[PDB]
């Protein structure tokens, strides 16, 4: 989080936007170019401004349209574009959750790479839409100590960076290296709360010095020593207090290489992280993960899809 990729059009204006996508879907077929190219090339804010006077120059709903013209992935891209900055993580929580079990990766993802302040955020809104409170729905659809961890982060509660009390960074390696290598078993309880608790800073400096204490990597220790899918959390944690950017790109990459796309996770990190960071996530994927991104989406997308994801960076 520093720049971004897309940003507000300057010298925009609601009403001729409202009627280029007016004119691009009005009547049989659709130009899907034109779409493609004007929603890229605005900040989310504007694009909730062109929904505005669509509705008041037409009486028409703008995704509606965009949904029952639009098909497929680059439909499914649209309607992510198209939802408001401020609800676009809940918006996703509830779909993670809801019905059948829970998508436990959308849930990690999620939940361990955003800030305390964006949690608040996520917390208040996905109440105000969807009346439950997130932390009961995440609760009554997890379980354990996956359940725990979630449960722990959702309370939006880390400490603020001071200075650090390297006593307490020696003191909480230990308490690290005690429970999980030396411990046979391991208590997870006391990882979630270190994890958890501790302001960024701080567990920069614990990582380091458990590596100095046992030789393990904090997650080379927490690869052999938890499974399902708190292992999943405590990995996806560790990894975005080390660098959230980083983490969002490893993920990325995983979602693509191989023989299909996670394209549910390359549009969801995608259309999130365009006007927080994704700038900063390309330059981790071209420093650690080989591929620039434009070139693995390229390689990996297709069409019309592709021709936006592309636009987006």
């Known amino acids: 989080v520093l720049r971004g990729t897309v940003t507000d059009f300057p010298g ?17 077929g659709t130009d899907e170019e034109s779409i493609l190219t ?3 090339s605005r900040s989310n804010a504007q694009r909730q401004e062109i929904s505005a006077a669509f509705k008041t120059l037409f009486g028409r709903d703008l995704l509606d349209d965009l949904k029952s013209e639009l098909t497929g992935k680059f439909q499914k891209l649209i309607v992510a574009l198209m939802k408001p900055s401020r609800l676009y993580d809940a918006y996703e929580l509830k779909h993670a959750l809801k019905g059948a079990g829970t998508n436990e990766k959308v849930l990690t993802e999620i939940i361990a790479s955003r800030t305390p302040e964006e949690l608040r955020a996520i917390k208040q809104v996905y109440e105000e839409e969807y009346g439950s409170s997130l932390e009961d729905d995440v609760v009554g659809d997890t379980s354990g100590y ?9 309370q939006a509660n880390r400490d603020p960076d001071a200075g650090i009390d390297e006593a307490q960074v020696e003191q909480d390696a230990q308490a690290l290296f005690q429970a999980g290598e030396l411990k046979w078993g391991t208590d997870e309880e006391k990882f979630i709360t ?13 990582f380091d010095k458990y ?4 030789g393990f990597q904090i997650e080379e220790t927490i690869d052999r020593e938890t499974s399902g899918n708190l292992e999943q959390l405590l990995l996806a944690v560790v990894k975005s207090i080390r660098s959230i950017p980083a983490y969002l790109a490893e993920t990325l990459y995983y979602a693509m290489k191989g023989a299909g796309t996670d394209d549910h996770t390359l549009i969801r990190v995608m259309v999130s992280r365009s006007e927080i960071d994704l700038f900063n996530i390309r330059k981790e994927f071209r420093k650690n993960f080989a591929t620039s991104l434009y070139s693995m989406i390229k390689g990996d997308t297709s069409g019309d899809y592709k021709k936006a994801l592309l636009l987006l960076c």
């Open 194 to 206: 270190i994890f958890g608790t501790r302001s960024v800073s701080h567990l920069r400096k614990v």
């Open 38 to 40: 004007l929603l890229t």
């Open 12 to 28: 925009f204006d609601e009403r001729a936007d409202a009627e280029t996508l007016r004119k691009a879907m009005k009547g049989l």
């Open 211 to 214: 590596m100095t204490i046992s």
């Open 146 to 154: 996956y359940q725990r961890m979630l449960v722990v982060l959702l």
